[PDB]
Structure 1
Amino acid sequence: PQITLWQRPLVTIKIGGQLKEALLDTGADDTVLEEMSLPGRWKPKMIGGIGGFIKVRQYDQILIEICGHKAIGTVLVGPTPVNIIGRNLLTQIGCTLNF
């Protein structure tokens, strides 16, 4: 679809069987979701932006469905205030910025 930026670009995603709302964030290199249980081994990682860094757990090869589009990629899980879909997954769904 064509998403305007008058409002926050929130989309419904499906991961681990759970439906969540997430922000399409072109400035985010990675995808970070609020605390949740994901299967598999994970690696600790530190990601930061405005306000500083947070410790997250990195899960690789996670299948996510973004607005009906399946994508596979690394997902970070941690105390983020908002679920963020970063570039690692937006590329997979063929998302582009147009103007």
Structure 2
Amino acid sequence: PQITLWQRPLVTIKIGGQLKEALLDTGADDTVLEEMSLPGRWKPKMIGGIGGFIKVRQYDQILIEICGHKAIGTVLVGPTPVNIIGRNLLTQIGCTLNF
């Protein structure tokens, strides 16, 4: 599909059997979701953006479905104000910016 930017580009994603709303964020290097339980071991990581850094848990090889498109990649979990789908997964679904 083609998504305009008049409003925030929010989409439904499926992860860990749960349906969640997330933002397609080209300004985010990685994907970070609000606190939730994921399987496997994780590594602590610090990510920074506007306002500073937050500590998140890094999970690798996580399967996520974005608008029906399956993608695998690293998913960070932490106190993010909104679920963010970053470039690491946007590339997997073939998302591009066009103008």
Q: List runs of 5+ in structure 2 lacking aligned partners.
A: none
Residue 29 of structure 1: SS of its match in structure 2? coil
Q: Give the structure 1 partner of residue 13 of structure 2.
A: 13
Residue 75 of structure 1: SS of its match in structure 2? strand
Residue 21 of structure 2: SS of its match in structure 1? strand
Residue 73 of structure 2: SS of its match in structure 1? strand
C-alpha displacement of 1:68? 0.3
Deviations 1:6-47 (CA, angstroms, capped at 9, x unpaired): 000000000000000000000100000000000000000000
Is the counterpart of residue 57 in structure 1 residue 57 in structure 2?
A: yes
CA distance in 2, matches of 1:7, 1:27: 16
Q: TM-score under structure 1 normalisation?
A: 1.00
User: What aligned pairs does 1:13-92 form with structure 2 within 5 A after superposition?
Assistant: 13-92=13-92
CA distance in 2, matches of 1:93, 1:25: 13
Residue 14 of structure 2: SS of its match in structure 1? strand
Runs of 4+ residues over 4 Å off in structure 1: none
CA distance in 1, matches of 2:14, 2:79: 19
- CA RMSD, Structure 1 to Structure 2 (Å): 0.2
CA distance in 2, matches of 1:67, 1:56: 25
Q: TM-score under structure 2 normalisation?
A: 1.00
CA distance in 1, matches of 2:69, 2:80: 23
CA distance in 2, matches of 1:83, 1:42: 18
Q: List runs of 5+ in structure 1 lacking aligned partners.
A: none
What percentage of residue pairs aligned between the two structures are identical? 100
